[PDB]
Amino acid sequence: GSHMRNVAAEQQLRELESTFDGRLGFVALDTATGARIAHRADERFPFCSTFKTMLSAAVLARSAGDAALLQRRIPYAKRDLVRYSPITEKHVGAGMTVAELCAATLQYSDNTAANLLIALLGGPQAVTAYARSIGDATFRLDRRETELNTAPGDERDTTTPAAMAASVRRLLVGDALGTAQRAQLNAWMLGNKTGDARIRAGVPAGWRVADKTGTGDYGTGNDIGVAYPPDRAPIVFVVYTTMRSRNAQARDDVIASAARIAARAFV
C-alpha cells in the first residue's frame, strides 16, 4: 500500500459519511506495516452487540487459569430469557456450556448468552476491567442486555473506533490472549452468522473474515473484526455508524462501503 492511498481512503470516508444523516467511525489497520486508515477515530460511539467480542475474550482469559470453565454447563429457565435469544431459547432447562454460550453470543448475537457470561464474570464492571487489562481504557460496559442497546451524547456503553481496533488487533492477531485462546476466539468469530451484509460484503470473497456485528436504535450499525487475505497480513476493520434520527434503520450498505474503501486502499 502507500501513504497516498491511505490519505485518499480517509477522504473517501468523509465523502461516504456525507451521503447519510449520521456519523461514521472507522479504523482499518494493515498489520503488515501498522498503516492506519481512520475517520472519527477518537470519537465515542455506542457499541451495541460488538462488546460481545470483549466479553468472550474475558471468558477465554478466565478459562486459561481455570480447570474446565469452558465445559461448565449453566442451567437457565425460559423465564430467564431476555429479548433476542435465538440459540439459548432452544436449550432451556439444563442449559448450555460456557463454550457454547460464547459461540451463541458471538455467532448469533444471543442476548441471554451474553447476560449469562456477564454474570459469570461478575458483572459489567468485570468486562470493563478485562478491557483495561488488555490496554483499553476507553471501552465502558455500564449495563447488561438489553438496556445497553437502547441508544445522543450518552457515554454509557461506548468506545472509540481506535480503542476497539487496538483491542481487536491484540485479541485476534496479537498476544493479548494465549496462542490457544486466540485460536478459539478467531474460530468463533470466523463463524459469525449476522454479518454477511457488512464487512464481509465489502471485501473480496477470497478473504476469510472474523467479525462481530452490533445493531441498535438511532440506526446504529456496527461491525468489528479481522479480514485474512490469502497471501498477506491480516487487516483489522472497525466500523461504527449511528444516525441522527432515532427511527432510522441501520445501513448495511454504508458499513460494507466503508470496509471496501479500506480494502481497496491496502490490497
Residue numbers in the entry: 22 to 172, 184 to 248, 250 to 262, 264 to 301
From the study:
In class A β-lactamases, a conserved structural element called the omega loop5 constitutes a wall at the active site that shapes the binding cavity. PenL (NCBI reference sequence: YP_439646.1) is highly conserved in pathogenic Burkholderia species, including Burkholderia pseudomallei, Burkholderia mallei, and Burkholderia cenocepacia. PenL has been used as a model in exploring various evolutionary paths to substrate spectrum extension through amino acid substitutions, deletions, and duplications. In this study, we demonstrate the extensive perturbation-absorbing capacity of the omega loop against TR mutations of various sizes, some of which are large enough to include the entire omega loop.
